[PDB]
C-alpha cells in the first residue's frame, strides 16, 4: 500500500557530505510531518530530524548530535523528503530511514551510510510461546509516561524491516493486526500481544515525545518458542 523508497547512501570519508532522498507513495504526503531516524549497532535507533507542513512554514527540528551539520527538506510536488549531511563523522555511520504518519506507521527500506539526556528503557529480551499474552514496557528517566508523550511502538524484522504498530499511546496503525494493543500501565507505556504468534518474533522499539523531539528505547528482543 504505502511505499517509502530511500536512496543516496554509500561509503564516505570523515569530513565529507552526502544527500539522502526518500520518495513516498500511497498516502497524502503533503499532509504529514516527515522524520529521519538512524540505526547503528552502537547507539541503537536514533531520531535525527523532523519537518512539518507548508502551513507550518516547513518548520524543522534536529537532534543535538546533528544540529548545524544536517538539513531536512521536502518537495511536496515530488512527494519527497531529503537529508543533507555535512561534515560527516564516524558516529554518523548507520542505516538511515525516512518515516512518519501517526507517528511512525510507515518506514522506508533504509539506506546505509558508512563513514570511515533522556534515557528510555525497555526489557532487553522476553520469551513467550504461541497463544500467550505478553506485555512489553517502556520507561522514561524523566518520570511517569503520560499521554503527552504520545508513545509509539514499532517492529523490526529481518532484514532491518520496520513497521509501525501503535501511535498516540494506543492508536493501532492501519492494517496492524488486532492482537497488538497499546496502553499506559504503572506510569510506563506498554505494548501487549494478546495471543502471540510465531511471526511476532522480532525486535520492538518504543519512542516517547518530549516537547519537540523523540527518544527511542533500546528495543526488546521477543522470542516466540514452540
Amino acid at each position: 500500500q504505502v511505499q517509502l523508497q530511500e536512496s543516496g547512501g554509500g561509503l564516505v570519508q570523515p569530513g565529507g557530505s552526502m544527500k539522502l532522498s526518500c520518495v513516498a507513495s500511497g498516502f497524502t504526503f503533503s499532509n504529514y510531518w516527515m522524520n529521519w531516524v538512524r540505526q547503528s549497532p552502537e547507539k541503537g535507533l536514533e531520531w535525527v530530524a523532523e519537518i512539518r507542513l507548508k502551513s507550518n512554514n516547513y518548520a524543522t527540528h534536529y537532534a543535538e548530535s546533528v544540529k548545524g551539520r544536517f538539513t531536512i527538506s521536502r518537495d511536496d510536488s515530488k512527494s519527497s523528503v531529503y537529508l543533507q549531511m555535512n561534515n560527516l563523522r564516524a558516529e554518523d555511520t548507520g542505516i538511515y530511514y525516512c518515516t512518519g504518519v501517526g507517528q511512525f506507521a510507515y518506514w522506508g527500506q533504509g539506506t546505509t551510510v558508512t563513514v570511515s539526556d533522556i534515557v528510555v528503557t525497555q526489557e532487553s529480551a522476553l520469551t513467550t510461546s504461541p497463544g500467550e499474552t505478553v506485555t512489553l514496557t517502556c520507561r522514561s528517566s524523566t518520570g511517569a509516561v503520560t499521554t503527552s508523550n504520545y508513545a509509539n511502538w514499532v517492529q523490526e524484522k529481518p532484514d532491518h524491516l520496520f513497521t509501525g504498530l501503535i501511535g498516540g499511546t494506543n492508536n493501532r496503525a492501519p492494517g496492524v493486526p488486532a492482537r497488538f494493543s497499546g496502553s499506559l500501565i504503572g506510569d510506563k507505556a506498554a505494548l501487549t500481544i494478546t495471543g502471540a504468534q510465531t511471526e511476532d518474533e522480532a525486535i520492538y522499539f518504543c519512542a516517547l515525545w518530549y516537547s519537540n523531539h523523540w527518544v527511542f528505547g533500546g528495543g526488546t528482543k521477543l522470542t516466540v518458542l514452540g
Binding site: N31, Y32, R52, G102, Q103, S148, Y150, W209, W214
Partner: peptide, 6 residues
C-alpha cells in the same frame, strides 16, 4: 504535540 493528524 507531534503529528497527531490521523
Amino acid at each position: 504535540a507531534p503529528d497527531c493528524r490521523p
